[PDB]
Design a protein around this ligand. Structure first.
Ligand code: HEM
Ligand code: HEM
Lengths: 365, 364
C-alpha cells in the first residue's frame, strides 16, 4: 500500500517488521577521530531517518531553496510513498576501537570463526557500522542510503553495499513464502513478528546478558552467499529435494502434503539442510532470518551470477548463527553454494521518541 | 493490467506500456549449426509463450520424473504474469554466422565513437539480446535465467543488466518517473498510443531496404553511469541549467507546467533538452525506454548508479546517431559517462501460435 512503518520504538524497525520487497544494505567505515563530531552525525542521521521513513525530504527539502545552494535532499524520491521504508543501524566490532568505547564492546558481538569452504572478500566484509534500508520501492531505498552517505561525507565512507532485488525471508507466516533462486520457498520456519515470546528468547538482548546499553537491541550476521546455478540446474528433482528435506512445488517436509506441516527430521537425509539447521538439531538455537536474493551481472564466462544475501538476527551470536553454521559443515547444500562476504553488527535498541538518537544508549548524553 | 499479449504484428515490449523493472541480457552464440539455432529459436518462442502468461516452461518446475532435472527452475512459481514482455533482438555480430552476412540491415548501423565514451567491451555488444520487462523483478530474472538455461550449449550470456523505474503499486501510472539525478524523465517522448509517430520514427518498413525487418525496430542500449556525488554538490540553479527545466515541477525555463512545450531559446545553449529536442536535430525523434540502475558501490566508495538507456527507432542512422552527436557539448556531460553500448535489430512480431522468433530472417 506504500504505508509507513513507525520509526520510533523500544526496538529498531526492520527486524521483526514484515519483510519488504527490496534491500539496500550499506556498511560504513568511520573517518573522524572526534567523538563529539560522531555524536553530532548520529543525531543528524536520526533526524534524516525520521524524515525518510515518513516519505519526507531531508533537511529543507529537494528544491525551493536558494538557487546558489545544493538542495538538502537529492530529489529522486519526490512523489513516492514511504513504501514501508525501514532504516536499521548497527555497530561493528571495529567501531569499539574508537572514541574510548573499548570497554563497551558486547561479548555477545562475537567475531565469527573461520568456516570450511568460505572465500570471503575482505573488501566486502566487515565495517564499523551498517545501515540496512528495506522498502517495497528500490528507488526509495537507494535514496535513503544515498542521502545518509551524503550527510555523513567527511565523517564516514561507504565501505561496501549490497542490493537485494527480492526477499528470501518471512516474518509473516500468514503470507506467501517467497522463493530463492534455487526455486525453493525460503522462510517457512523462521520467527514471526507476532511471536513476542520467541523474539524475547531468541532475538532481543536483555540487561542480564551482560551489556546494559544493548538491552532491546539484537546482533546481526550478514553473509553474501554465491549460488552455483549451473551445477544446481543440472541436478535431478529428487536430488534437489533431498538437499533441503522439503519437496519443491509445495515446500512441505519430506513425506508431508503441506508447506507448514512440521518436519519429521528422521525421514530426511542425514545431510539435509533443514535437518541440520533445525533448532532441535542445535540444542534449541533459533534464528530470525531476513535475507534477500541478489544478482551480480555475469561471471565473465557466459553464466549469470547470483546468490543470496543472508541476514540473521539473534540475541547472542555465540548461541545463534555460530552453532547453526557449524552444524552445516556436512550440509548437502554446501555443494551448491559458497560464502563470499561476511560481517557482524550490534544493532542497538530503538529510537524512543523525537528527542532520542541512534546510539544514545552507547554514547550517553 | 496483469499481462501483455505475446503475439502481434510487432514484438511486445516496445510500444506497450512501460513496466516497473528490467532484466536485459545480451547473449553470444556458441553453435555453428544453423538448424540447431533455428531449433533454439523455436524452443525459446515456446518458452516465451509460457513465461509471458505466468506458466512454467516445458513440463514445469516439479511433478516430473524424480531422476530428471525439472524443465523450469521454479523461482517464479506462485508469481503472476506481471505484464512480462520478452523482446528479442539480433546484433550485428549474429550476421557473420549461419550465412546471414547479406541479410544484415543497413539500418543496423554500428555506432561511431562519441566524445567522452568510456566503453567496457565486456558489457558491450552481443550476438543477441532479450529484454525482459515486468513489474516483479523476480519474474524478469526467472525468464532470463530459464531462457539462458534452455539455450545453454547453443548460447551463453555475455552481459546482464537489472534496472528499475516506478513502483506502480504505489506510484500513479501517469506520473513521470524521476531519474537518479532527481529530474522527471520521459516528459517529451514517443508514446505507444501515437500510431502515426511510431510508423514514422519507430517501425521499419518494407521499402526501407530490408524486407525481413518490416514491423521490427532498431534498438540502441547505452549503460550510462552518473557521477552522483559531484552532481549532489551542484547548486540547484546549476542542475536546472543543465537540463533546461526546473527540478521541482519539471517545467521548461519560462513555463509553469511540466508538459508546457519548451521555449528552447530561453534555455542555455548547452542545455540537454535544447540539444536533444527534435527541432535541434532536423526532426529526429526517439522512443526512449530506459531504466535506472544501481549496482552497488565502486572501489572508491561511490555509488555505481545511472541510466540504462534504451532507444527504439526506425533507423539508427536517423535516430540515436544524430541526437547523440548533438549532445557533444551537453552540460550534462560533466555528470555522466557512457560505459557500455550495444545495437540490435529487433524483428517483427510472432504472428500466431505456429510462428517463431526470427522466422522472417531464417525463413519458414
Ligand atoms: C544460499 C544459502 C541458503 C539457502 C538457499 C537456504 C535455503 C533454505 C530453505 C529452502 C529452507 C527451508 C524453508 C524454511 O523453513 O525457511 C531453509 C531453512 C533454514 N535455513 Fe537455510 N538456506 C541457506 C543458508 C542458510 C544459512 C547460512 C543458515 C544458518 C547459518 C541457514 C539456516 C536455516 C534455518 C535455521 C532454517 C530453518 C530450519 C527449521 O527450523 O526448519 N540457512 N533454508
Ligand atoms: C544519464 C543520462 C541522461 C539523463 C539523466 C537524461 C535526462 C533527461 C531529462 C531529465 C529530460 C527532460 C524530460 C524528458 O522530456 O524526458 C530528457 C529529455 C530528453 N533526452 Fe535525455 N537524458 C540522458 C541521456 C540521453 C541520451 C543519451 C539521449 C539520446 C542520445 C537523450 C535524449 C533525450 C531526448 C530526445 C529528450 C527529449 C527532448 C525533447 O524533445 O524535449 N537523453 N533527458
Amino acid at each position: 500500500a506504500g504505508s509507513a512503518v513507525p520509526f520510533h520504538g523500544a526496538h529498531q524497525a526492520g527486524i521483526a517488521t514484515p519483510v519488504q520487497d527490496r534491500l539496500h544494505f550499506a556498511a560504513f567505515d568511520v573517518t573522524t577521530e572526534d567523538r563529539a563530531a560522531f555524536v553530532a552525525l548520529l543525531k543528524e542521521w536520526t533526524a534524516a531517518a525520521r524524515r525518510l521513513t515518513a516519505g519526507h525530504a531531508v533537511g529543507e527539502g529537494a528544491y525551493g531553496g536558494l538557487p546558489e545552494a545544493p538542495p538538502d535532499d537529492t530529489g529522486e524520491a519526490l512523489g513516492l510513498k514511504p513504501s514501508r521504508l525501514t532504516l536499521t543501524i548497527g555497530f561493528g566490532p571495529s567501531l569499539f576501537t574508537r572514541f574510548g568505547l573499548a570497554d563497551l564492546r558486547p561479548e555477545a558481538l562475537a567475531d565469527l570463526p573461520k568456516f570450511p569452504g568460505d572465500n570471503l572478500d575482505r573488501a566486502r566484509s566487515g565495517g564499523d557500522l551498517c545501515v540496512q534500508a528495506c522498502a517495497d520501492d528500490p528507488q526509495v531505498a537507494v535514496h535513503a542510503i544515498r542521502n545518509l552517505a551524503r550527510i555523513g561525507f567527511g565523517k564516514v565512507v561507504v565501505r561496501w553495499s549490497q542490493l537485494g532485488f527480492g526477499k528470501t525471508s518471512s516474518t509473516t507466516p500468514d503470507k506467501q513464502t517467497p522463493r530463492n533462486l534455487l526455486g525453493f520457498k525460503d522462510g517457512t520456519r523462521n520467527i514471526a513478528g507476532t511471536e513476542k515470546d520467541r523474539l524475547d528468547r531468541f532475538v532481543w538482548a536483555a540487561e542480564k546478558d551482560g551489556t546494559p546499553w544493548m538491552t532491546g537491541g539484537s546482533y546481526l550476521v550478514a553473509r553474501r552467499i554465491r549460488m552455483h546455478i549451473e551445477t544446481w540446474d543440472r541436478a535431478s528433482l529428487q536430488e534437489q529435494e533431498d538437499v533441503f528435506g522439503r519437496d519443491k512445488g509445495e515446500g512441505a517436509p519430506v513425506g508431508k502434503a503441506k508447506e507448514r506441516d512440521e518436519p519429521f527430521l528422521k525421514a530426511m537425509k542425514p545431510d539435509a539442510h533443514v535437518r541440520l539447521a533445525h533448532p532441535d538439531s542445535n540444542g534449541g538455537a533459533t534464528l530470525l532470518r531476513r535475507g534477500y536474493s541478489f544478482t551480480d551481472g555475469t561471471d565473465g564466462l557466459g553464466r549469470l551470477d547470483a546468490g543470496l544475501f543472508f541476514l540473521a538476527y539473534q540475541r547472542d551470536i555465540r548461541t545463534g548463527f555460530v552453532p547453526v553454521q557449524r552444524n552445516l559443515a556436512t550440509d548437502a547444500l554446501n555443494e551448491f553454494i559458497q560464502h563470499v562476504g561476511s560481517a557482524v553488527f550490534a544493532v542497538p535498541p530503538g529510537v524512543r521518541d523525537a528527542d532520542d538518537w541512534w546510539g544514545s544508549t552507547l554514547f550517553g548524553k
